Amino acid sequence: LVKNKCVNFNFNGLTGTGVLTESNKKFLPFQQFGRDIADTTDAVRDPQ
């Protein structure tokens, strides 16, 4: 996994494209993804 660079990502079949970075978002232990106003993914928990 590669950070601070534009990548054509896929997490658990969630295909997209973006600059991945580490984040301060406290996902509670049950939460796997985070979403924007558009109903598009905005953060993810790395499954590895």
Partner 1 sequence: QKLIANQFNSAIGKIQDSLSSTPSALGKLQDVVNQNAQALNTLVKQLS
Least distance to partner 1, CB of residue 32, Å: 19
Which of 28, 40, 46, 48 touches partner 1 by CB under 8 A? 40
DSSP 5: S
Least distance to partner 1, CB of residue 42, Å: 12
Q: What is the rounded distance in angstroms from the CA atom of residue 5 to the CA atom of residue 21?
A: 8
Least distance to partner 1, CB of residue 35, Å: 9
What's the per-residue H, E or C state across 16-29?
CCEECCCCCCCCCC
Binding site for partner 1 (CB under 8 A): 37-40
